[PDB]
């Protein structure tokens, strides 16, 4: 319920407001942890195990949904046992830094970021899969509404529960930042908590990347089947001749999204452009296809362009082909909104600056 | 039963978690404010309709552009908060949060929440902003941003006094049903 009101009801008296506010926050950590271990076991029990031992879906499809559930439950379980051992040697918790570091620094860090990256990287896609499967398979859709009916799901769905690993990870620097503000400065313990905090943000950046790549890779695989670079193996200009074989699959994506091409005298053109590492690419959404067609090349190499901002138009910007060969070629492109023009510029200039 | 999903987004440290905490408990945390609100289903009635509203905090996810959106799918209503004691958090509405929310949440209704209103009238707070040539956000600035981004409604509140909290979720639920 609360720390002052439960454990240490007698020893509450002899303490300062900072030392109390500190124990309240350490306790929130210890409790929300055992609470998350329980959320993880609800998955294991109500879902993973039953789906496995009843064959609700192919082993391969299950693997992608719960890559490493047992290793995850072991990460958190091992820690919650450390937590439980400390809570033991006195309702008043002295030094907590060694513990934090035992989970968020060094090899412990490596273990956690690998284990959480594998569990989350694919989630987004597997949840699409489950939505599909509920729609198309009556056997599946019944299993689901039988399991989610269970009392320990707290009336939440699979797709809610499962994102709780990612969520818990993001609560760890908030929890630390809190413990830090109520810890005596100049302590080794204060210093160590900060190393731990900064290391959590680092884990999070690592998982953030895992997801980005995994999602981006699968998206790019998608965009490659729909791709139409016919008009390119002959073409008009050899500026765009060498990209008749493309393959988005070998590139990394930085950013993507819609863009209106102000190409001719009051003649526009709606595109969907991809910002890869070396390349800006200009596909036009047909219906279920994507077109590489030229005049202007539809594939700008980054090392050879300049980004130039408009003055009255807060949605528009220019990109300029800096190769001597390939004349006055300038792409005037219009974003969704000032905010979209703005993100686009920064990303662009980064991309180009890295080119 | 009607299951709807709420996702509350906004800048860090502009109220998000505090707001969700009072509402679900119908009372402002007295002894100690929590840092962690967990995915929770709230029972709310509106227009004689009973709703199960899934409540989703996005706290901690503000710097992680590709984690954040794991939170957006199948969302019936988005609470976009800024803080009234922070005209910065407000200009981030049109510039960071709406373009995002409209991308991952096509045609999902947005209600603009002005938080920490109990501070538009606080002399300490008013000074500090007076330090950077700023002053606490006025109601018409909120109302105008709300019509600028195409919000369903604009609602101000105070987690402290509890004033306008209840009224904020009721709006959000009305929004979900529509």
Calculate the CA dihedral of residues A228, A231, A232, A238 and round it to 10 degrees. Answer: -160
**Cβ atoms < 10 Å from Cβ of A128:** 12
- Where are chain B's structural domains? 1-178
Bridge partners of residue A249, in order along the sequence: none
Give the DSSP letter of residue B76: S
- Where are chain A's structural domains? 1-229, 230-355
User: Which residues neighbour A333 within 8 Å (Cβ) at sequence distance 6 or greater?
Assistant: A259, A260, A261, A262, A271, A273, A316, A317, A318, A319
Q: Are A312 and A295 in contact (CB under 8 A)?
A: no
Enter the tokens of residue A220. Answer: 């790019």
Residue with tokens 């995850």: A72
Taking CB atoms and an 8 Å limit, are A127 and B59 in contact across chains? no
Alpha helices in chain A (DSSP H): 17-42, 50-53, 59-65, 69-86, 97-104, 107-120, 123-136, 138-147, 158-161, 164-181, 188-225, 338-353
B2 touches chain A (CB under 8 A): no
* Secondary-structure breakdown of chain B: helix, strand, coil percentages, each rounded to the nearest 5: 40, 25, 40
For the segment(s) A230-355, the CATH number from 3.40.640.10, 2.30.29.30, 1.10.3720.10, 2.60.120.10 is: 2.30.29.30
Homologous superfamily of A1-229 in CATH?
A: Dbl homology (DH) domain (1.20.900.10)
How would you classify the pairing of strands A270-276 and A253-261? antiparallel
Closest to A153 (Cα-Cα) out of A251, A241, A42: A42
Backbone dihedral region for residue B116 (phi beyond 0: left; psi -120 to 50: alpha; all else: beta): left
Q: Which of A30, A31, A171 to mutate to test the interface with B (most CBs of B within 10 A)?
A: A171
Distances in whole angstroms, Cα of residue B31 to Cα of each of A8, A30, A211, B22, B92: 15, 18, 39, 13, 32
CATH class of B1-178: alpha beta
Closest to B9 (Cα-Cα) out of B74, B63, B81, B114: B81
**Cβ atoms < 10 Å from Cβ of B128:** 12
DSSP letters spanning A265-286: TTB--EEEEEEESSEEEEEEE-
Closest to A214 (Cα-Cα) out of A109, A281, A120: A120
Closest to B36 (Cα-Cα) out of A179, A170, A202: A170
B94 touches chain A (CB under 8 A): yes
- Distance of residue A238 Cα from the nearest chain B Cα, in angstroms: 36
Residue with tokens 């974003």: A335
Q: Is A233 helix (H, G, I), strand (E, B) or coil?
A: coil
User: Which residues neighbour A282 within 8 Å (Cβ) at sequence distance 6 or greater?
Assistant: A261, A271, A273, A292, A298, A299, A300, A331
The C-alpha atoms of residue B10 and residue B59 are separated, in whole angstroms, by 9
In angstroms, this model's resolution equals: 2.8
Q: Is B81 helix (H, G, I), strand (E, B) or coil?
A: strand
Closest to A38 (Cα-Cα) out of A49, A26, A46, A27: A46
User: Which CB contacts under 8 angstroms, 24+ apart, belong to A219-222?
Assistant: A219/A253, A220/A248, A220/A249, A220/A251, A220/A253, A221/A249
Which residues on A lie below 8 Å from B51 (Cβ)?
none
The C-alpha atoms of residue A221 and residue B153 are separated, in whole angstroms, by 40
Segment 126-165 of chain B within 8 Å of chain A by CB = none
Enter the tokens of residue B135. Answer: 């002053």
Taking CB atoms and an 8 Å limit, are A160 and B39 in contact across chains? yes
User: Which CB contacts under 8 angstroms, 24+ apart, belong to A39-44?
Assistant: A39/A161, A39/A164, A40/A69, A40/A72, A40/A73, A40/A76, A40/A164, A40/A165, A41/A73, A42/A152, A42/A153, A42/A161, A43/A69, A43/A161, A43/A162, A44/A69, A44/A70, A44/A73
Q: Are B77 and B175 in contact (CB under 8 A)?
A: yes
3-state SS string over B110-147? EEEEEECHHHCCCHHHHHHHHHCCCCCCCHHHHHHHHH
Which residues on A lie below 8 Å from B96 (Cβ)?
339
Q: Are A253 and A216 in contact (CB under 8 A)?
A: yes
User: Which residues neighbour A225 within 8 Å (Cβ) at sequence distance 6 or greater?
Assistant: none
The C-alpha atoms of residue A57 and residue A140 are separated, in whole angstroms, by 8
**Cβ atoms < 10 Å from Cβ of A278:** 13
Are A1-229 and A230-355 in the same CATH fold?
no
Segment 101-130 of chain A within 8 Å of chain B by CB = 120, 123-124, 127
For A137, counting Cβ atoms within 10 Å of its Cβ (0-12 exposed, 13-18 middle, 19+ buried), the class is middle
- Distance of residue A330 Cα from the nearest chain B Cα, in angstroms: 27
Q: Are A212 and B69 in contact (CB under 8 A)?
A: no
Bridge partners of residue A253, in order along the sequence: A276
């Amino acid at each position: 319920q609360n720390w002052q009101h439960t454990v240490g009801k007698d020893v509450v008296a002899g303490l300062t407001q900072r030392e109390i506010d500190r124990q309240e926050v350490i306790n929130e950590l210890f409790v929300t942890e055992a609470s998350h271990l329980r959320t993880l076991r609800v998955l294991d029990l109500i879902f993973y195990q039953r789906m496995k031992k009843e064959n609700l879906m192919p082993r391969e499809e299950l693997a992608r949904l719960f890559p490493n559930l047992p290793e995850l439950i072991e990460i958190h379980n091992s820690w919650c046992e450390a937590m439980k051992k400390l809570r033991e040697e006195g309702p008043i918790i002295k030094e907590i830094s060694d513990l934090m570091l035992a989970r968020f620094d060094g090899p412990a860090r490596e273990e956690l970021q690998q284990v959480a990256a594998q569990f989350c990287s694919y989630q987004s896609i597997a949840l699409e899969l489950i939505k599909t499967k509920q729609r198309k398979e009556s056997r599946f859709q019944l299993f689901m509404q039988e399991a989610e009916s269970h009392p320990q799901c707290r009336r939440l769905q699979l797709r809610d529960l499962i994102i709780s690993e990612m969520q818990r990870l993001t609560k760890y620097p908030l929890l630390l930042e809190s413990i830090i503000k109520h810890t005596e400065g100049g302590t080794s313990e204060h210093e160590k908590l900060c190393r731990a905090r900064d290391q959590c943000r680092e884990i999070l950046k690592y998982v953030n990347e895992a997801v980005k790549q995994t999602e981006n890779r699968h998206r790019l695989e998608g965009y490659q089947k729909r791709l139409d670079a016919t008009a390119l193996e002959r073409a008009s200009n050899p500026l765009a001749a060498e990209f008749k074989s493309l393959d988005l699959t070998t590139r990394k994506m930085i950013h993507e999204g819609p863009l209106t091409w102000r190409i001719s005298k009051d003649k526009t053109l709606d595109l969907h452009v991809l910002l890869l590492e070396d390349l800006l690419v200009l596909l036009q959404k047909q219906d279920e296809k994507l077109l590489l067609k030229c005049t202007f090349s539809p594939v700008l190499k980054l090392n050879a362009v300049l980004i130039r901002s408009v003055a009255t138009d807060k949605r528009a910007f220019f990109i300029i082909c800096t190769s001597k060969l390939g004349p006055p070629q300038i792409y005037e492109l219009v974003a969704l909104t000032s905010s979209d023009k703005n993100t686009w510029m920064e990303l662009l200039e980064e991309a180009v600056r890295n080119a | 039963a009607i299951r709807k999903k709420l996702v509350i987004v906004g800048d860090g440290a502009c109220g998000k978690t505090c707001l969700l905490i009072v509402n679900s408990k119908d009372q402002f945390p007295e002894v100690y404010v929590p840092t962690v609100f967990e995915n929770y289903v709230a029972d709310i009635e509106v227009d004689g309709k009973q709703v199960e509203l899934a409540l989703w905090d996005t706290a901690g996810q503000e710097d992680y552009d590709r984690l954040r959106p794991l939170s957006y799918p199948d969302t019936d209503v988005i609470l976009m908060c800024f803080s009234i004691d922070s005209p910065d958090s407000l200009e981030n509405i049109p510039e960071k949060w709406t373009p995002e929310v409209k991308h991952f949440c096509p045609n999902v209704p947005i209600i603009l929440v002005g938080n920490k209103k109990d501070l538009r009238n606080d002399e300490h707070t008013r000074r500090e902003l007076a330090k950077m040539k700023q002053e606490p956000v006025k109601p018409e600035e909120g109302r105008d941003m709300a019509n600028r981004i195409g919000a369903f409604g604009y609602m101000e509140c105070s987690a402290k006094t509890k004033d306008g909290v209840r009224e904020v979720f009721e709006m959000a639920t009305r929004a979900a049903l529509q």
